[PDB]
Amino acid sequence: KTHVQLSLPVLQVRDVLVRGFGDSVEEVLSEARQHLKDGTCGLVEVEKGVLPQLEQPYVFIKRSDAAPHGHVMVELVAELEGIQYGRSGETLGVLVPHVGEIPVAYRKVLLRK
Numbered sequence: 001k002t003h004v005q006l007s008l009p010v011l012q013v014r015d016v017l018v019r020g021f022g023d024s025v026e027e028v029l030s031e032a033r034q035h036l037k038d039g040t041c042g043l044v045e046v047e048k049g050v051l052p053q054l055e056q057p058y059v060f061i062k063r064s065d066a067a068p069h070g071h072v073m074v075e076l077v078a079e080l081e082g083i084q085y086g087r088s089g090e091t092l093g094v095l096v097p098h099v100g101e102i103p104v105a106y107r108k109v110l111l112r113k
Contacts, residue, residue, distance in 0.1 A: 003110045005071050006036060008043040008061075009103035011096065013050045016042070018097040020055030025078040025085045032059040032076055032095045036111055042098035043107050046091050056080055059095040062088030064112055071110040 021031035035041035043061065044050060051058065057080040065073040076095075077086035092107060 002113065003073065004036075004113050005069065005108070006039075006041075006111055007106045007108050008041060008095075009098055009101070010093070010105040010107055011042040011044055011098070011101045011103055013044050013053045015101045016044060016054070016096050017099050017101065019053070020057070021059055021095070021097065022057075025057050025080050028057045028059045029076055029078050029085070031097075033113070035095070035097055036113075040098050042096045042101060042103070043093040044096055045093045051094065054094060054096065060084075061092045061095060061109060061111075062086075063090045063092060064088055068110055069108075071108045073110045073112065075112045 021028040060077045061074040064075045
């Protein structure tokens with residue numbers, strides 16, 4: 001399927017144990033997609049002070065369209081030293097590995113895969 005319904009656990013930035021997916025734009029997008037498929041991907045909502053507490057390159061989910069079954073359609077955009085790889089809508093948050101942190105909420109998304 002071109003899209004997959006996912007419910008992403010929303011994590012507090014200070015709880016996150018693994019603060020990024022890797023060391024290159026290509027690796028972080030690769031790893032993010034793998035973790036999204038394996039159900040091991042968390043989401044941190046972006047506010048003042050959040051991104052400096054996480055490791056670059058960043059992987060964002062961004063709204064790709066204006067929401068089937070409550071699932072917002074999103075796509076992945078990576079960011080490294082202020083340059084984004086991909087073009088999309090409003091940031092829903094920054095993706096991180098999930099390794100058993102307790103979420104505060106769930107974000108239903110339809111991921112363009």
